[PDB]
Amino acid sequence: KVQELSVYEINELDRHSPKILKNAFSLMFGLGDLVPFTNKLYTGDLKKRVGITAGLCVVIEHVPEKKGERFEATYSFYFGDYGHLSVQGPYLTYEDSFLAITGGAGIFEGAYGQVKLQQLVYPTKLFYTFYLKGLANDLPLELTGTPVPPSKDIEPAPEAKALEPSGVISNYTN
Amino acid sequence: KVQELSVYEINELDRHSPKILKNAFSLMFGLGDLVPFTNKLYTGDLKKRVGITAGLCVVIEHVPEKKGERFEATYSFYFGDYGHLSVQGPYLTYEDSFLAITGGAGIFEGAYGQVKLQQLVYPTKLFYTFYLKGLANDLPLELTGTPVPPSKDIEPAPEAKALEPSGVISNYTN
């Protein structure tokens, strides 16, 4: 069975990220450019800080027709002591995409399926919906609150941005 | 149940690829050298352009006794509107290898198994056979035409090279 899990990834610009290694033949982004990154991750209902994303975007090409870039991305999503999910696939700055769920650990051991990536504000706000298969158990209720509908205006709960106990999961990843 | 899917990956020299990021203290490839890449991808029967490969080869070592290199590769195969497959594992310039199928998306959601990489003409032509498990449905017929047996002299159909509708899949990746 599929268990839907939604999360918001927010770049609050306080993690030295993105770091752009610029090597391409072109002034614009192009093959050769690498972007290691790490953003914050919140629950789909925006009530709690869960952890971080972490990994590498490999630039594949500039896409002038779409005024954007194609990256190939390899990264993980960290949920404090619950574990993590890993993914691989396309990040297009100009449109939504789906990535492969390559596996997980902790409660996410056995994870497979795909995840939808929706960019809400370039490059600071993204919304994901994992269509998760393979998990041993139902997801914890803490993570499965009704998601806030995605739009450019979303913000995590103030207590979650503030790292108050009510706004974080235990040992949220940082 | 295994569904075999074969494709040809061709470097037509028009995608700025490969891009070599040099760090090893050697005239030869060595650990430290990174090689982002993206080549064109055609059906196993060579009749249609499907998309591209995209990702990163990490040089592991030069192998003088084999006159070649070992890379560790993490990358995806894009099939236009159908989705993508992702892989991880060894690319040896000097011999065939098997890589892990880490997952997929679109029609390839749930994909697992291994893929055989056959190096046909270095560095411009490779032939792959995915031994695909976990797919929801039989693959579309236009992807499963009897493959052209691999040889150094294979060429995509002229319609596929020229990007005519009869020689491409819908929204073929570029």
Added chain:
Amino acid sequence: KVQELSVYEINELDRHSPKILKNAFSLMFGLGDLVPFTNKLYTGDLKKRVGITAGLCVVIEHVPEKKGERFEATYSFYFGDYGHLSVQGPYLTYEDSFLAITGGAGIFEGAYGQVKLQQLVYPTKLFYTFYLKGLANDLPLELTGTPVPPSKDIEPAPEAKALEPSGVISNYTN
């Protein structure tokens, strides 16, 4: 059915590894720094050389309060003619972690699950415990011997370090 598999990873200083690609503006590791690496891999009982590890550590952040680093790692474990296992996940220099098994090839085709990483000497000796599902067959007995108790003092069997027939698996990876 889960099959447990333990192996030792040792940096014997003869593979040019690790290579530190320094891009962060600090003397400390930081986002931007990339570390391609490849170490030797021995059985859990330390009697046999099996192969190598090979891949890339991406620095995510320095963790000064823990006197260590967080990396996001993408790499494979090579077992000679047996095949390989691929992983994605966290490597923290200051505490044990679990990584996702993203897939495998050979006897490891269909592999999934998670793997524990335990550092014994930073960064030259590590001990892993794979929790493997999905395999077609029971693991070969030469890989499932009782592990040597993990400590900073572990050493491969003399025959294995010297690459004598009795101390290696067939076509052990190098």
